[PDB]
Design a protein around this ligand. Structure first.
Ligand SMILES: Nc1ncnc2c1ncn2[C@@H]1O[C@H](COP(=O)(O)OP(=O)(O)O)[C@@H](O)[C@H]1O
Ligand code: SF4
Ligand SMILES: [Mg+2]
Ligand SMILES: [Mg+2]
Lengths: 287, 283
């Protein structure tokens, strides 16, 4: 029972933060994890291990020349709750695919054999920013089965999810890639709550959890580490833990179901967030 | 002497918009422009067309099964000012790639003689949200000369510019790719004005202009139209008009010179934004 989980989600939402704390519980619980920070953007492995920025496979492969010279012991960095930390690393810019990058990390890791051990989980942290080859990798490759879309009360977030869905679709008909559900993060939005719900439903999944916005977090980060770690007794902690059980316990893995644009348009409209439109279109006060 | 520029940057700043107001000025300004939407995220073409969404090639292609089919018309939509509007087409979700996607467009445009008809400008609607192999193409495949990053006083918007810069480099040595300036799209940040400048310098370029946040913007948007088209007699309308001015000229085409993280951090330190960092790490 070693579960191979990956998150997606656009960025700027909180994607990373969550997945970490979210692990932190998963640890407090009594399981074993290893985050595979596939985010160029975010610091998939930061709160845990406490250093602002870890070394990346690339950057290492970099300075040594090839995965060869990459001795595990350096890439792999022991964290909180014996938590697993390896940063895949972002493509040299202007030049390179993000697929190959990550892939590498995997063929590395499988090869330097990390997946072995005892571990309970494999958390691929990922960019839902744009669903392209590079990203579907762990998908396509089939290296991640259980996928959770970090969602939110936001039109992009919305949008991502959907692509990250067709994402899945293209392949589920192939292997075992499946979607646990979304995870509305709090964005103070009026009716987020329902909104995310509308999706999942529309889609074919649930909304595993919903994350309130509590200063504590912020306060947690600013400190460079988990919220768990900050004040396990803090409310939000139980906030997270929940989701942590929640996931363990998921038995709702599904072959998503992409929606139209249109449809997406309505919901936004309906729950009121993408304001109604008229056949105005002109003149500018000249009418 | 048709120029091949292209705008880049992070999604969610208005790029597509500011990009689009610009393109209009050029028009009010006599210039013959064409614009190639190569962003999956945004409204690249639109506001020239008053269309809910243009039909992308790669999207058009699919229908026939081939592009060899795809009829120019079907693909080149003529918007206000006579702005040749074309939209690349997304990276087919989960399976496929952007570069692969942009390309297709370009060949096809040349191949149908898009690039003739006496042109004054061509804008590439790019997305540096993550500049990888394939958001570089139009670079690497030297079809975009005149680069301008779109920035704004914020953490990843900047982060990216740098990166997006690093792109230009690589193709330094490759030659023919130079970064015009930046354009700060104000986010009401209290030292923005200042900040972006700071980058620019540390970077080694000029922040050509600083797009303000005049609600007269949206009011157009919401009408699927350019500020100009809208109220042309508008504080904003000039502001865009001032940008095309500075742009049909701007002769300082730098080779960038990228900064380090802390350098970066720092700036954000400097303005308070990413103010002081605590040394302690406990609870
Ligand atoms: N095409 C997309 N695919 C997946 N996620 C998307 C997409 N568009 C938006 N989302 C998310 O929204 C953000 C980018 O959109 P945004 O910042 O609004 O765009 P723009 O500059 O065109 O207005 C990213 O975090 C991205 O992941
Ligand atoms: S596969 Fe995707 S991320 Fe990689 S280079 Fe192509 S478009 Fe960019
Ligand atoms: Mg984040
Ligand atoms: Mg925009």
């Amino acid at each position: 029972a070693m579960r191979q989980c990956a998150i997606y989600g656009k960025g700027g939402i909180g994607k990373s933060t969550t997945t970490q704390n979210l692990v932190a519980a998963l640890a407090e619980m009594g399981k074993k994890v290893m985050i595979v920070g596939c985010d160029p953007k975010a610091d998939s492995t930061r709160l845990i291990l406490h250093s602002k920025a870890q070394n990346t496979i690339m950057e290492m492969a970099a300075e040594a020349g090839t995965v060869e010279d990459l001795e595990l012991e350096d890439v792999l960095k022991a964290g909180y709750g014996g938590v697993k930390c390896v940063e895949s690393g972002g493509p040299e810019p202007g030049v390179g695919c993000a697929g190959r990058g990550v892939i590498t990390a995997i063929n590395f890791l499988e090869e330097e054999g990390a997946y072995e051990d005892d571990l309970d989980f494999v958390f691929y942290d990922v960019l839902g920013d744009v669903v392209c080859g590079g990203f579907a990798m762990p998908i396509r490759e089939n290296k991640a089965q259980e996928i959770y879309i970090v969602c939110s009360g936001e039109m992009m977030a919305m949008y991502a999810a959907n692509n990250i869905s067709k994402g899945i679709v293209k392949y589920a008909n192939s292997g075992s890639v499946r979607l646990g559900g979304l995870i509305c993060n709090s964005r103070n939005t009026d009716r987020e709550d329902e909104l995310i719900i509308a999706l999942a439903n529309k889609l074919g999944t649930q909304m595993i959890h919903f994350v309130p916005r509590d200063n504590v977090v912020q306060r947690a980060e600013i400190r460079r580490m988990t919220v768990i770690e900050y004040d396990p007794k803090a409310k939000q902690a139980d906030e997270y833990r929940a989701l942590a059980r929640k996931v363990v316990d998921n038995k709702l893995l599904v072959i998503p179901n992409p929606i139209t644009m249109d449809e997406l348009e309505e919901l936004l409209m309906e729950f009121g967030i993408m304001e109604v439109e008229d056949e105005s279109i002109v003149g500018k006060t000249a009418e």
